[PDB]
């Protein structure tokens, strides 16, 4: 028994991360190559923050005017091709990240394209700088890299086989998806549930979640996917929790229907989770369920999951639910 699974979703949704978790969980020089990529993540993350400070409205100010010189150092090196990563970089990088103004700009990151792994790596510069550095499993999970094309990852669980297919979520890339529509066990559709306050990259205008919603309706209602069921991976629940509890950007100020929404009776909140988060996480779910409910006609079904792709302690648990559901197909 083999099962061909297609992973779908917008850009930076989780797709790649999840393939990674399958390798952590159900598979086995190899990591020295990935170190460079993490450093790039760190570079692209710090520049992006400072570069954005002066272009925001209102513009942001450094708490320490001394730092202006590092700000100058970073922008000077921003374009450099095969960047050398001298120990100055890390020094200046760290210093900036200590500056409360640089951070205050980072709070307003919903207003410019900033990778998810920023705050993670910017909190651990001193570890990455060492020449004897070797990335932790969570470091490899967090390393963001764009997927161009389609990548087949084969693994097995209990002699049962799985072929997993990774695709680009970016608009230009979606044109390749079709190639995996025939002979497919089930769709795993990934959503960055936390991205409710930020616009997409491709046009810098269209809201990320709304893009995700429209992309789901496209897939759910596709002409070549009326048989095929979709496992819905509402993902980035940690980041979602953060925002709701942080209270900086309200959801109803982006999705006004939220004000006219009370929490479901069938809700099963995780032990001692905040009623506010509860309300929020299930509302994003129901938004997706309306699409799946509307059409379908018992030929395919929607199975939601609350997911944290960077938490293997939640991937195993939910991937287990998916092994279960795969019983009939």
């Amino acid at each position: 028994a083999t099962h061909r699974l297609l992973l779908l979703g917008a850009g930076e949704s989780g797709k790649s991360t999840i393939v990674k978790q399958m390798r952590i969980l159900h598979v086995n020089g190899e990591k020295a190559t990935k170190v460079q990529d993490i450093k790039n993540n760190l570079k692209e993350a710090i520049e992006t923050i400072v570069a954005a400070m002066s272009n925001l409205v209102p513009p942001v100010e450094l708490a320490n005017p001394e730092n202006q010189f590092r700000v100058d150092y970073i922008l000077s090196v921003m374009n450099v091709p095969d960047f050398d990563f001298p120990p100055e970089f890390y020094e200046h990088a760290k210093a900036l990240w200590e500056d409360e103004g640089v951070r205050a700009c980072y709070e307003r990151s919903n207003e410019y394209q900033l990778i998810d792994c920023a705050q993670y790596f910017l909190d651990k510069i001193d570890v990455i700088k060492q020449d004897d550095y070797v990335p932790s499993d969570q470091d490899l999970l967090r390393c963001r890299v764009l997927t161009s094309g389609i990548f087949e990852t084969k693994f097995q669980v209990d002699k049962v086989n799985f072929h997993m297919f990774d695709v680009g979520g970016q608009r230009d890339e979606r044109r390749k998806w079709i190639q995996c529509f025939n002979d497919v066990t089930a769709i795993i559709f990934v959503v960055a549930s936390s991205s409710y306050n930020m616009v997409i990259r491709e046009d810098n205008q269209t809201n990320r979640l709304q893009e995700a919603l429209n992309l789901f309706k496209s897939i759910w209602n596709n002409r070549w996917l009326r048989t095929i069921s979709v496992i819905l991976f509402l993902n980035k629940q940690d980041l979602l929790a953060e925002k709701v509890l942080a209270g900086k950007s309200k959801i109803e100020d982006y999705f006004p229907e939220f004000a006219r929404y009370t929490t479901p009776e069938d809700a099963t909140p995780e032990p001692g989770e905040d009623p506010r988060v509860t309300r929020a996480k299930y509302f994003i779910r129901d938004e997706f369920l309306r699409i799946s409910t509307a059409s379908g006609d018992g030929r395919h079904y929607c199975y939601p999951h609350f997911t944290c792709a960077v938490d293997t302690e939640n991937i195993r648990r939910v991937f287990n639910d998916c092994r279960d559901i795969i019983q009939r197909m």
């Binding site: 529509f181 025939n182 002409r223 070549w224 996917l225 009326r226 048989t227």
Partner: protein, 189 residues
């Protein structure tokens, strides 16, 4: 169910032959629409006769363009030896119906070997056809060919087992697709 059934099957070790007429346009001006079409049909009938003996399955007649892979419907060991001898026949075939027409014209033959998909598309007016980059190459080989000569690739030589007197073709000089994809081309004697 959800996709239409595709009537297409994958096939490796096959050899694709495109054949075009050199100076067809000059002929097209010298005789009436009647005569041209009659001379055309009279030629491709001969071509089809030669095709079946040389074990090549004819695919389509496109205006003045003829193509017929060998190695179909079921594999053949001499799948490239066929086409060469098949192409050989077309140069003679055309010559007979060349000087009898008045104006001199010639066949320009290009050949490649590789994998193809084949079968039929759509629902209506089915015609058996072939597709692959190897077919795309095949067609460009004909484009970048020489009159009365047979253009062959490095692949359609790794199948010829050194039976024909070859020589450098310089396909990069006649066709951009060949040059830009860096293809070593040859000609026969």
């Amino acid at each position: 169910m959800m996709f239409h059934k595709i009537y297409i099957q994958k096939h490796d070790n096959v050899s694709i032959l495109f054949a075009d007429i050199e100076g067809f346009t000059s002929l097209a001006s010298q005789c009436t629409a009647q005569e041209l079409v009659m001379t055309l049909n009279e030629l491709f009938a001969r071509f089809d006769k030669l095709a079946a003996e040389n074990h090549c399955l004819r695919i389509k007649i496109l205006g003045d363009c003829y193509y017929c892979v060998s190695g179909l419907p079921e594999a053949r060991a001499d799948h490239a030896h066929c086409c060469v001898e098949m192409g050989m026949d077309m140069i003679e075939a055309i010559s007979l119906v060349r000087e009898m027409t008045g104006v001199n014209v010639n066949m320009r033959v290009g050949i490649h070997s590789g994998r193809v998909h084949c079968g039929v598309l759509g629902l209506r007016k089915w015609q058996f056809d072939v597709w692959s980059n190897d077919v795309t190459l095949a067609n460009h080989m004909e484009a970048g060919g020489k009159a009365g000569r047979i253009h062959i690739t490095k692949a359609t030589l790794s199948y010829l087992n050194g039976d024909y007197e070859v020589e450098p073709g310089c396909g990069g000089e006649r066709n951009a697709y060949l040059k830009e994809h860096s293809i070593e081309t040859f000609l026969i004697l």
